[PDB]
Structure formats: C-alpha cells, structure tokens
Design a binder for this molecule. Structure first.
Ligand SMILES: Cc1c(C2CCCC2)nc(N(C)C(C)C)c(-c2nnn[nH]2)c1-c1ccccc1
Length: 133
C-alpha cells in the first residue's frame, strides 16, 4: 500500500550526469550515446507481493518483476547480467545490482508529482526525473 505512490506510467523529463554514470558502470561508447538519447517510460504496477517495473523506449524495453528483499536475476538495458535486490527503505525503492565484484545502487523516490531516480556508481551520481504520462 505505501508502494501505491509509485504505481503508474512515468515519462523521463530530465537527466543529469547520466553519461558519466554510464562510463563509471562500464557502458561502451555506442550504447552510451544511443541510450542517452532515449526518453523512456517507466511503468510500475503491483499485484499482491509482486512489483513489476517496465521500461519502454526506442532503445530497449526492459521488465523486472520482484518481491521486496528477494534477490533475482536481471539483464539490464546495457546488457549486463546482474543479481539484483530491491527493498523499501523509508519510502524509497532501493535497487542494488551486483556483477563481477561491482555494485551500483538505483533509488526511486516520489517527490512532489515526480518520480526521482538517483543512480550511484562509486563516486558518480546521476539524477533522472520522471513525470506522470
Ligand atoms: C541504459 C539504462 C540504465 C543503465 C545505465 C548504466 C547502468 C544502468 N539504467 C537505467 N535506469 C537507471 C533504470 C534502472 C531506472 C535506464 C532507464 N532509464 N529509464 N528507464 N530505464 C537505462 C535506459 C533504458 C532504456 C533507454 C535508455 C536508458
């Protein structure tokens, strides 16, 4: 139920530092350039204990379904195969992706009428803001 504030269709409206975050993660040039152009929709739904987050774009469509606290396999939009765990911490969805001894954290938070996504890899943070579509 507190997860209700996330449900819906969200469209990217701004992005800051995403190229440098992608570089830090290890995304190659071509994928950075093409991925960086996209204005994805993020579609969030809940059925019972299962949360589904889909991203749809010109570049790639991705979909994950998960139970909070329960690790799962994810193939990311940049084609990493990762092990992911998503929890709710103080009203924020915290998504940790682990692969090859590395880790990145993606936070999704509701702020005003936006969904704000903060992505961190080592010292590099990117902020992506989505609005209802
Ligand atoms: C490539 C990519 C990445 C990876 C870049 C480096 C590591 C993660 N993360 C995303 N985030 C952070 C999601 C998890 C919120 C999105 C993304 N942006 N909106 N939805 N998905 C995209 C993306 C998807 C399709 C079109 C362009 C961009």
């Amino acid at each position: 139920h507190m997860c209700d504030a996330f449900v819906g269709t969200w469209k990217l409206v701004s992005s800051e530092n995403f190229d440098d975050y992608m570089k830090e993660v290890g995304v190659g040039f071509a994928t950075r350039k093409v991925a960086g152009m996209a204005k994805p929709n993020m579609i969030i739904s809940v059925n019972g204990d299962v949360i589904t987050i889909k991203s749809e774009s010109t570049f790639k469509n991705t979909e994950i379904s998960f139970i909070l606290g329960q690790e799962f396999d994810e193939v990311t939009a940049d084609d990493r195969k990762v092990k992911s765990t998503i929890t709710l911490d103080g009203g924020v969805l915290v998504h940790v992706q682990k692969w090859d001894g590395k880790s990145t954290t993606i936070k999704r938070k509701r702020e005003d009428d936006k969904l704000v996504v903060e992505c961190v890899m080592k010292g590099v943070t990117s902020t992506r803001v989505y609005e209802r579509a």
